[PDB]
Design an enzyme around this catalytic site. Structure first.
Site, short mmCIF file in Angstrom:
data_model
loop_
_atom_site.label_atom_id
_atom_site.label_comp_id
_atom_site.label_asym_id
_atom_site.label_seq_id
_atom_site.Cartn_x
_atom_site.Cartn_y
_atom_site.Cartn_z
N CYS A 28 42.31 29.41 35.79
CA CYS A 28 42.91 28.08 35.70
C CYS A 28 44.40 28.13 35.78
O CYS A 28 45.01 29.19 35.66
CB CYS A 28 42.45 27.34 34.45
SG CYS A 28 43.07 28.04 32.90
N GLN A 82 20.62 53.54 43.51
CA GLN A 82 21.57 54.23 42.68
C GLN A 82 22.82 53.40 42.45
O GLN A 82 23.43 53.54 41.41
CB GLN A 82 21.93 55.58 43.29
CG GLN A 82 20.76 56.55 43.30
CD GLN A 82 21.12 57.87 43.93
OE1 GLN A 82 22.03 57.98 44.76
NE2 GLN A 82 20.37 58.91 43.58
N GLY A 102 10.25 58.92 45.79
CA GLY A 102 11.35 59.86 45.70
C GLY A 102 12.68 59.38 46.24
O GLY A 102 13.14 59.85 47.29
N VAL A 103 13.31 58.43 45.54
CA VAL A 103 14.63 57.96 45.94
C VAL A 103 15.71 58.81 45.25
O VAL A 103 16.91 58.59 45.46
CB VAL A 103 14.85 56.45 45.70
CG1 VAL A 103 15.27 56.18 44.27
CG2 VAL A 103 15.88 55.90 46.67
N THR A 106 16.23 61.88 39.43
CA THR A 106 16.71 63.10 38.76
C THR A 106 18.19 63.35 39.11
O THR A 106 18.99 63.67 38.23
CB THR A 106 15.80 64.27 39.11
OG1 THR A 106 15.77 64.42 40.54
CG2 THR A 106 14.38 64.05 38.60
N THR A 107 18.56 63.15 40.40
CA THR A 107 19.93 63.30 40.88
C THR A 107 20.84 62.34 40.13
O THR A 107 21.90 62.74 39.65
CB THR A 107 19.98 63.01 42.38
OG1 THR A 107 19.01 63.83 43.03
CG2 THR A 107 21.33 63.28 42.98
N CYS A 623 13.56 17.83 19.75
CA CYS A 623 13.33 16.44 20.15
C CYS A 623 13.33 16.24 21.67
O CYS A 623 12.58 15.39 22.17
CB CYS A 623 14.29 15.50 19.45
SG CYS A 623 16.01 15.67 19.98
N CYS A 637 18.68 14.53 16.40
CA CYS A 637 17.93 15.08 15.29
C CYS A 637 18.70 16.09 14.45
O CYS A 637 18.12 16.67 13.52
CB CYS A 637 16.59 15.63 15.76
SG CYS A 637 16.72 17.16 16.72
N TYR A 850 7.73 21.02 51.92
CA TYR A 850 8.62 20.26 51.05
C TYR A 850 8.19 18.82 50.94
O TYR A 850 8.06 18.15 51.94
CB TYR A 850 10.10 20.45 51.41
CG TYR A 850 11.07 19.89 50.39
CD1 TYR A 850 10.99 20.24 49.05
CD2 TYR A 850 12.09 19.01 50.77
CE1 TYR A 850 11.87 19.70 48.10
CE2 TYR A 850 12.99 18.49 49.84
CZ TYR A 850 12.89 18.84 48.51
OH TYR A 850 13.81 18.35 47.60
ZN LIG Z 1 41.95 30.06 32.39
ZN LIG Z 2 17.43 16.69 18.76
#
Ligand SMILES: [Zn+2]
Ligand SMILES: [Zn+2]
EC number: 5.6.2.-
Length: 1102
Positions: A28, A82, A102-103, A106-107, A623, A637, A850
């Site tokens: 800001c 990794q 096996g990617v 362990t390495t 609520c 509430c 949609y």
């Molecule tokens: Zn700021």
């Molecule tokens: Zn409430």
């Protein structure tokens, strides 16, 4: 940007910042007054405003060192997996190592322990076998300097090393300790009293073998048994537990669970480390399924001669397995078996001594409980479709059959019934075998009812998926290709299998005709040898942000929910794909909303332009009251148990650091784009890689095609959202106040459109009683009934002229939002809101396209869905693909999968898919039938135009008589009518009355109308009607017509008397038109804001 403010959007001070700055990844103006600063960190530090930005700086710097270190000490750069793991490590986060074959875990474990010891941190590396300890310590020692205290412990340890390890582990401030799982299990208390910064577990299964080990590893980071037991009681209950905020644990890193994570203990990881020990459920498949019409061993021979190597045959039973084995042995093929010499032939196939392996459905899947070599298996052959077979007699009948039969017949009164008891309950009620099998053939759709030999065949889709899956996995970063061949002659079985495969895996089965064996074999072999090459890594990690939890669930259904990190307000799931990792999470709605606090009801004004001000949404979990203002408790509430979207936002900012690329997957409308912007703007200072995808279908296809459509945020849509929101806020507030001073109640007017519509209803009451025109119904002799104007008294109808013509009748276009709401809420006895919700769950569960569309357009893929379904039902000659519309944002509400409602009910009752009420199924059925009709052929009809004379009135009557040729009338009924002959028909009965010309409104009629007038949009229709109901302005009667109440009449009377300009249909439509023009960047954002302000200013005086 849209020049607006967001309340907690500053990356550094954690406060209010403008859209425009966050967009440029800046803090800001308070934190940094300068426009375009030189360097953010340096400038913040200079102005003495450096606060939270430090975290990011230090993060980036602490990671890029790691990377650099790794790239130095080790061969080359980090792999995607990794990379994500490293980014999680610098945050001190604990996780599972979700990755393919096996990617190199362990390495990573080694380099992590090394990089940490470089700072002074102590780490431990755990391995299942005692040999892996030796090998890992071996690899470690040669790369580590003298500075690193390295020790080890295993079986064949020395005579002075075994005690050296103990004394050093007791006092000597070690750095890295490599030991077995056995040591963990045995010396629980010893380790429990020690604190590790990093713990690497290679095999989780071996350590999860004992319950004590969970508490051991948990105490290996500094967690007392008190929190452990409290969390244990909480997880024993059936709810979540909360870790004390004052806790700083070490880094526990484990591999994926091989076996199912059974037990109560693993839940302690979900609360203390916020990571779930998941199992590797990899849905990554690249299989081509081909179907052969005949179980001909000649075809099998030819295929085997093409495939040549690494073929896996599956037989239904072992008898046909042995038979096939003999036939192939005779034709001189190097073949093996699973039933006789299991291990010998298995490993001989593993090496390459065997080219063909023949196994059984139940035999192979259980013998292969260990290894199952994927780099060998290229082709899977199914000798028959894997299926479950049941007998259809009064005896030998399974539970679910008599269940679905008696439940429908009426007997099932719910008290859990023994199977033989149900047999004896149906033994008396509609009891014949014939009656029985007929009820079975009638009820069960989507299975195979062999009524001939009294059998029920249910294709086992799961088994097929797994077995076919054996031919394609990820190897050396390459998703290798595989062919799955099915030998099936029964069309019913093949169709059933195909439908449930399309449902679950969205994978198609093609015919032998449309499959080139040479080409396919080539693709397979080429991909294999591509994986054999030296890998240069292409894997990336990807974050996908959606707004609703349902989308996330159905997304996990086809991406595969391996593990789920609980991150504050949200639950981020992770999945393995062929392109890398893939993280997805749900916001759980909107994040920001207009503040009620300042300016003009939240909209501030500076330099002649308007500035919207947004604040994070808060929802009381008790609520349910929602608010924007920053309060400790619920304003209603007074409860502290609230959900704060600011936490959700912070959580997103956290996750965004791990992900290489981010994609916002909100709905393809204005609403979705606004949310997408509220999110991308907030994240923009954190991650530079942020784009937008619009998913029209929640399926693998919808997703792929959505990523084809990848783009940046469209500000015109955001601007449009803003405009509409501002109109509802301003007009709503002004009118609501004017009503506070007349009817006592506070909140009454939700906007302009709402009042307009209510006006329609109110005055409709008046113009309904005035349409009372006298009528008469006439039952004709051996003919139809005719509805004519009142005063008729001749009892004879003469036929004047009669003409007939052949015509081909076209079906109605597919459903849009308006159409769907109207027809569906009319055909069903439901409110438009209930319908809208059913539609939403339907889209969000990836069953329809949609559901918020104003287009009837249909793509080649939709047409294709219709085509395949018709080919499935046998009536494929009636297929007529129709695009329906060229002008289209989205497609019309249509099914995504060629599956009718009955089949869905079957899959549900079976247990394949769940979570669909009877109402959902009925709605789906309506959408389905509409769409197919719209894709079926024109019904050829012969209709007549009869001119009749009734009481000195020449009245024509046009009716369809003969349906010459069928078409879409199979889905949507087409009513015929008895022919008139050129004679004189006598009146049987005259029923005189006076029914109204202009009828009242129904919810369906209101939607239709506002669509017809240009009022409201696909998103607002149902919501408008429902609001009218919630405010008590309107009610429904016996025949479900919409009628205004006393309150509604009073309200609209006041509003019409005084504020007629702001409720007039002309004004509402003109504004609706202009805003929609803003959405397309045809009308100016600030200018229309100026307009709305100029009329609001006029209203503050009346
Ligand atoms: Zn700021
Ligand atoms: Zn409430």
């Amino acid at each position: 940007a849209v020049n607006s403010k967001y309340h907690h959007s500053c990356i550094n001070c954690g406060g209010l910042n403008t859209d425009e700055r966050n967009e440029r990844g800046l803090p800001c103006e308070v934190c940094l007054p300068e426009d375009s600063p030189s360097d953010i960190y340096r400038a913040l530090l200079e102005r003495k405003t450096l606060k939270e930005y430090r975290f990011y700086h230090e993060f980036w710097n602490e990671y890029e060192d790691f990377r650099s270190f790794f790239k130095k000490k080790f061969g080359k750069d980090l792999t995607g997996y990794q990379r994500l793991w490293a980014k999680r490590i610098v945050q001190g986060k604990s996780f599972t190592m979700v990755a393919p074959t096996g990617v190199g875990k362990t390495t990573f474990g080694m380099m992590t322990a090394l990089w940490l010891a470089r700072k002074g941190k102590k780490s431990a590396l755990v391995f299942p076998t005692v040999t892996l300890v030796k090998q890992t310590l071996e690899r470690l020692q040669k790369l580590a300097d003298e500075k690193v205290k390295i020790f080890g412990f295993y079986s064949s340890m020395k005579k002075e090393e075994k005690e050296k390890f103990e004394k050093s582990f007791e006092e000597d401030d070690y750095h890295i300790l490599v030991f077995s799982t056995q040591f963990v299990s045995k010396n629980r208390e010893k380790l429990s009293q020690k604190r590790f910064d990093f713990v690497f577990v290679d095999d989780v299964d071996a350590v999860l073998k004992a319950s004590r080990n969970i508490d051991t590893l948990l105490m290996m980071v500094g967690i007392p048994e008190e929190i452990i037991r409290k969390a244990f009681s909480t997880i024993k209950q059936g709810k979540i537990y909360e870790r004390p905020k004052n806790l700083k644990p070490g880094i526990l890193v484990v591999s994926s669970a091989t076996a199912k994570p059974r037990g109560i203990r693993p839940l302690l990881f979900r609360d203390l480390l916020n990571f779930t020990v998941g199992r590797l459920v990899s849905v990554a498949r690249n299989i081509t399924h081909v179907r052969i019409s005949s179980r001909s061993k000649e075809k099998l021979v030819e295929l085997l001669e093409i495939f040549r190597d690494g073929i896996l045959i599956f037989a239904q039973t072992e008898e046909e397995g042995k038979e096939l084995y003999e036939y192939l042995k005779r034709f001189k093929f190097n073949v093996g078996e699973t039933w006789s010499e299991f291990e010998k032939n298995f490993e001989d196939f593993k090496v390459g001594k065997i080219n063909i392996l023949i196994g059984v459905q139940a035999y192979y899947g259980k013998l292969t409980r260990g290894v199952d070599l994927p780099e060998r298996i290229k082709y899977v052959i199914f000798w028959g479709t894997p299926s479950m077979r049941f007998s259809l007699e009064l005896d030998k009948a399974p539970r679910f059959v008599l269940a679905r039969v008696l439940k429908e017949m009426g007997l099932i009164k719910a008290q859990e019934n023994p199977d033989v008891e149900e047999l004896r309950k149906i033994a008396k009620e509609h009891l014949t075998q014939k009656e029985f099998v007929e009820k079975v053939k009638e009820m069960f759709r989507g299975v195979v009812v062999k009524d001939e030999d009294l059998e029920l065949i249910i294709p086992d889709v799961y088994t097929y998926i797994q077995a076919s899956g054996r031919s394609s996995r990820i190897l050396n970063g390459v998703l290798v290709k595989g062919v799955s061949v099915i030998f099936e002659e029964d069309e019913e079985i093949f169709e059933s299998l195909k439908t449930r495969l399309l449902l679950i895996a969205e994978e198609e089965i093609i015919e032998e005709a449309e499959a080139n064996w040479k080409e396919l074999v080539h693709e397979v072999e080429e991909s294999r040898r591509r994986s054999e090459r030296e890998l240069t890594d292409t894997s990336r990690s990807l974050l996908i942000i959606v707004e609703s939890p349902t989308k996330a669930e159905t997304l996990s259904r086809f991406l595969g929910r391996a593990s789920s990190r609980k991150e504050r307000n949200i639950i981020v799931h992770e999945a393995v794909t062929g392109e890398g990792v893939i993280l997805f999470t749900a916001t759980r709605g909107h994040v920001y909303d207009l503040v009620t606090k300042g300016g003009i009801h939240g909209v501030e004004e500076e330099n002649g332009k308007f500035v919207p001000v947004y604040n994070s949404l808060k929802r009381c979990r008790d609520c349910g009251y929602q608010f924007t203002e920053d309060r400790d408790e619920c304003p209603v509430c007074s409860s502290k148990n609230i959900d704060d979207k600011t936490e959700t936002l912070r959580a997103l900012r956290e996750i965004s650091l791990e992900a290489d690329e981010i994609l916002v997957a909100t709905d393809p409308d204005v609403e979705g784009e606004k949310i997408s912007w509220d999110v991308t703007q907030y994240l923009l200072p954190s991650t530079r890689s942020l784009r937008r995808i619009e998913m029209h279908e929640i399926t693998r296809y919808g997703f792929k095609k959505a990523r084809e459509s990848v783009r940046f945020v469209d500000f015109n849509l955001v601007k449009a959202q803003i405009v509409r929101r501002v109109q509802d806020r301003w007009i709503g507030f002004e009118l609501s106040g004017k009503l506070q001073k007349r009817f006592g109640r506070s909140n009454l007017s939700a906007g302009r459109v709402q009042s307009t519509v209510l006006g329609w209803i109110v005055e409709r009451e008046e113009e309904y009683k005035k349409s009372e025109k006298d009528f008469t119904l006439l039952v004709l002799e051996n003919g139809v009934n005719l509805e004519v104007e009142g005063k008729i008294a001749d009892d004879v109808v003469t036929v004047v002229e009669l003409q007939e013509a052949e015509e081909e009748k076209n079906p109605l276009p597919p459903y849009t939002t308006s159409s769907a709401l109207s027809e569906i809420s009319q055909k069903l006895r439901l409110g438009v809101q209930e319908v809208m919700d059913i539609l939403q769950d339907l889209f969000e569960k990836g069953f329809i396209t949609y559901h918020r569309t104003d287009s009837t357009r249909i793509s080649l893929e939709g047409q294709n869905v219709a085509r395949t379904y018709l080919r499935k039902i046998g009536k494929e000659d009636i297929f007529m693909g129709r695009s329906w519309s060229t002008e289209g944002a989205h497609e019309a509400i249509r099914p995504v999968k060629p599956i009718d409602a009955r089949e869905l009910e079957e899959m549900i009752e079976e247990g394949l898919i769940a979570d669909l009420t009877k109402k959902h199924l009925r709605v789906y059925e309506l959408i389905f039938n509409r769409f197919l009709a719209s894709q079926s052929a024109a019904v050829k009809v012969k209709k007549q135009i009869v001119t009749v004379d009734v009481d000195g009135k020449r009245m024509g009557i046009e009716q369809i008589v003969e349906i010459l040729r069928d078409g879409w009338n199979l889905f949507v009924p087409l009513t015929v009518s008895p022919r008139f002959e050129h004679r004189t028909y006598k009146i049987k009965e005259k029923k005189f009355y006076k029914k109204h010309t202009v009828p009242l409104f129904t919810q369906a009629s209101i939607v239709e109308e506002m669509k017809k007038r240009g009022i409201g949009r696909p998103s607002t229709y149902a919501k408008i009607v429902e609001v009218l109901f919630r405010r008590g302005y309107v009610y429904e009667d016996k025949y479900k017509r919409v009628r205004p109440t006393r309150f509604g009449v009073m309200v609209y009377s006041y509003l019409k008397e005084r504020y007629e300009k702001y409720v007039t249909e002309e004004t509402t439509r003109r504004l609706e038109e202009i805003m929609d023009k803003v959405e397309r960047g045809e009308e100016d954002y600030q200018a229309t804001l100026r307009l709305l302000y100029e009329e609001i200013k006029s209203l503050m005086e009346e």
